[PDB]
């Protein structure tokens, strides 16, 4: 297998469950911008990540030093907020 | 000043217009409940309050003082969430 869509569909049916019991709602093509975004800057934390704020962090971190190399347009406009309701959520 | 309903479709319309632009979506019921919640705990906002980090971290303070009083249980599960966004857009 060498689909380009690999996980998404299971990351995105999560994303949704977790947002949506705190009111929160994501278009499908946005909640699969992000799941492209997080495996491109985070390959490791589905392999080898939890849904746990160690691991998150990082994946904060890492995100963060993307933006700062790459400039905050080359990032979808939901990462950050999806990322600090997962933070939330994980607290 | 606050009163009922007064002021809640202003209100709702000017939340979703400011989530909706991060890709984050709420139900019209979530957002008047929220409303709700707001204009109870801080109702010197509307009145007094500025759009900005400064009088929303003392509606924060206000929320949190609620649910130390009443309980996590008392306020809505979408509050927190809804809060924490709107930080976000004014930083
Ligand atoms: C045209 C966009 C305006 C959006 C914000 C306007 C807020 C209206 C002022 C609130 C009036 C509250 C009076 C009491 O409290
Ligand atoms: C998903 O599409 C999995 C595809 C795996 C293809 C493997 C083919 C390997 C061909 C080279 C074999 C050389 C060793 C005999």
Redesign the interface.
């Given at each position: 297998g060498v689909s380009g869509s690999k996980g998404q569909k299971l990351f995105v049916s999560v994303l949704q469950r977790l947002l949506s019991?705190?009111?929160?709602?994501?278009?499908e093509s946005?909640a699969i911008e992000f799941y492209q975004f997080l495996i491109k800057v985070s390959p490791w934390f589905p392999e080898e990540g939890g849904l746990n704020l160690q691991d998150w962090k990082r994946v904060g971190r890492e995100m963060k030093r993307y933006a700062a190399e790459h400039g905050t347009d080359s990032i979808?406009?939901?990462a950050?907020?999806?990322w600090?309701?997962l933070r939330?959520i994980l607290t």
């Open positions: 019991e705190r009111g929160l709602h994501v278009k946005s979808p406009k939901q950050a907020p999806i600090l309701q939330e």
